[model samples]
Target: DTHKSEIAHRFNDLGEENFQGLVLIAFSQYLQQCPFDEHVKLVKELTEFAKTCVADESHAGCDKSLHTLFGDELCKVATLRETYGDMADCCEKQEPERNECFLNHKDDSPDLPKLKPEPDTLCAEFKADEKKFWGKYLYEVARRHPYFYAPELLYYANKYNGVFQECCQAEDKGACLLPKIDAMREKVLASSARQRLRCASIQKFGERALKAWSVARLSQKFPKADFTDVTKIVTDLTKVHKECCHGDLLECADDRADLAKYICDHQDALSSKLKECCDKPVLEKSHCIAEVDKDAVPENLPPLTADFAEDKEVCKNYQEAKDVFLGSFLYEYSRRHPEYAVSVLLRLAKEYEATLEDCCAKEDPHACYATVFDKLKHLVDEPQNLIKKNCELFEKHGEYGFQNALIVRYTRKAPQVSTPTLVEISRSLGKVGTKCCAKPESERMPCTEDYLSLILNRLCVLHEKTPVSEKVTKCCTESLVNRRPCFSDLTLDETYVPKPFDEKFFTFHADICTLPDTEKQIKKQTALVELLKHKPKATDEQLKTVMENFVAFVDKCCAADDKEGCFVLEGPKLVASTQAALA
Candidate 1:
């Protein structure tokens, strides 16, 4: 009746017909999807809107009409039944009997009764209690709306140094401490509502809330420890949570629950336990930490050369010599042909591993070890001699070693190069090595060595002849670091020669253009000297023609801006032009 009266008073100044029509329209809209429980809420909203209508002066004539419309017996009876009830005794009664029944009814008002001052502002009352505050507030709020307010309450509780600190000093500490931490754990893990809200809050509030809360809780448990020490432990645990539970609210909540549980369970003894373990003798440290959590400790794997236990002393020397030999061989090889460093180094390591197992693992290992060490010593003493020695060694195994080495080296160095280019370089090197080293054993070594040296020396010379632009260097460096294919279209000038073995091999062609001017000039002059060696009987005019034609061709067709055409035509054209000039 009071609700209807209030609504009637607000809408009374509107015309009675208009007021009733407005109510009907609103009620129909509200009824579309209105739940049973929300009917009163819809009424409340309509009443508020009615209040605004009464304030409008233009509806002044509606007051008298409102009273007349509401005074109708049927309207009065309908309002009374809705507000009260439809009992048989009241239904059979006249107006007097109905009014008497209404007076006799209990005050079953839907509105909440006013709470006493203490319980009404219980949070403030609890806050006033100082030491008893957090426990009182936490339990009250959690018991009421555990999921909605638990996290926010706990956040403040920790901020004010209430729960952990007060509980630590209380006589009934377990009762005080355990319930709050357990409440937090349950609230954190069991409530997806809290988890979603907390995840957003964490982003807004930053990690300071969590970190501060952890530190405060830990400080109470470890009162004797430095704050810095407590901070390190909390920081590490928090880092693990963030890393593992980065994406989802549920995951974050689970992580927090786990961390909270760990802290709570270990609160009494964790600090002293860690301190005692850390102070233990050096040899026992691993075991001591492992006692706390075995997974926290790392394991020691056996060394690479651990298997030769019975022949330890001999095998150790053999391993040492082999390492030195292989290391020196690879180092020299990479320097001579840096573009193929990746593949070459990989093959060298692979072959050395296989060879060590085959030849050096015997009762009389001296024979195998002596031969390897002697060859290594010779190569080390005369670094230049390694070119010929490597050629011979590669051929002894049918030069598959060289082919494999080149493929491994080139691919390793430029893995970002397209698959087709990778196949082209690998197959080209294999084909070239087969043809160059196809001679009889006595002659093949020199032939292979000479041809490979010529290709390498020519590559260096061509690289030296046309300096890499600053833009190209910058692009390549950035692209390499970013793991993209850089300098794919970079081409060399006409003075530069392409890979003799593979017309498709652009690895060296691309890399050589990155060299500086001075170095390029030196390499070009060295290559010219080497090229002139082939035609020592030719006259100065022929050499002059070669030089002139080279310069003219480079100027005419090898413009730096014309990368595609230069890349395509530079190598073959230069070779043809030089050969023609010599002829």
Candidate 2:
């Protein structure tokens, strides 16, 4: 009555908007609080409410929702009717009498005796013939407290090989054995064990134990049925147990109510199948049941992959190597102090990759890599000092200001490339700087560094000789000026892949690439203003790279059909390569 009122109030409060969702919540809560005796009344009330909801077109859709919500409990209620007559009729008597009658019937029901041996007696008996003692001990405990004793029974059954099978065959009705076997199955599926042990237990005793338990239940349910008829029923029930419970008998206890409900719901088809099985001669009955079980089991289950410990060990080694390199003083210092970036440090480190690889060729390569990091720690300290010292050296040369500016730009960008690529690209950049700047005073421009753009163009032409994909060629062809630096950058980036050109490519380029020269210059200046707003201490060199890269993008890749694709493909690689050379 209280539940009825509460559900009514909920429906009224929720109105039509979320009435179904609210009802499901209320139904679940009611079920949790409901007593076993009140189940019949509660189900009838819910059925009537569901009918009214379905009758109204606005609430018709909620019928299916309610069906799933109450399906499990409804099945249990139906199974109870099959086993115990009308519950309402039984409840009509005085409360005490009704309760006493239910208890009496429950005690008389066919079930295993719940019992356990005294601790002292079990210990004493266990010492004498340990294997036989456990079988008897497990049997005694399982009779009374099957669920509680399951783990221990499975433990011993697993410990003593073939002992569980022997115990099953010797036991009465195989009652104790079924629970223990089911308990063992739960452990096998849920936890990892030796493959040999898993295979031996399931292959040897699993099916036989299930078959024994099925026959026992069939005989108890149909006492007067012939052995032939009984065997047919056992086969049918066995298939049901396997299908619903995954061959675990204990799991079947919970699923049995639902199975009974399903069978009752489809009684006409089940009766037809049963008649066909019964008509078969005793000799062919087993074969007929085998065919039925075959149809019952599902095909196309996913194949199991064995997880080996060795894969984890290999991953651990790779992660440790990555951590050591990333955590090194040079890498961290370069990251924090961008002006004295890690490019020079990485250039020095590139020689060690080959040396270490050769030295640890047949040994622990990861360990050798670690030792290489340890060895290189003393080479550079406080890159600012190194930059200051190098600044003085370049200043002493004829093209002092130009050399210092180039050094600063190179260091700022050089960290983008990995060590080996940086070594090669920096060497190439240095060669060009020397030849152009070291020319005779009369031959050199008044500001020789004015030719830095020309030297960059020459490097871009040299890099074009390296083959890129056809898509890269089409997208980057027009922007040879930009493409050269882009390709140089690609050499440094290991993960860069060419992206396909698409419609959005044009729009992206138009936004950033196309503008009047005046507007372009204004936009770049605006960007610098925004940058300075955010980073007040922004350096001239940093600002210069920003404008140069932007202008390069606008000039080279922006107007192409594959503008965005080309930039995505080339940008990272170009940036890394030039950055490495500068570093």
Overall lDDT per candidate, in order of appearance: 0.38, 0.36
List TM-score per model, in order.
Answer: 0.17, 0.16
**lDDT, candidate 2, residue 346?**
38
Off by over 4 Å in 1: 1-355, 360-363, 370-372, 381-544, 549-583
Provide backbone clash counts, one per model.
Answer: 5, 16
Lowest lDDT sum, 10 consecutive residues, model 1, at 479-488
lDDT string, candidate 1, 157-270, tens digits: 443345555555555556665566555643433232323222322443466434543343343334344344456566755553343223211223333444444544554444
Using alpha carbons, what is the TM-score of model 1?
A: 0.17
lDDT of 2 by residue, 87-184 (tens): 33443354345433332222111234323323344334445666445444333333222122122233333343343434533425245444555555
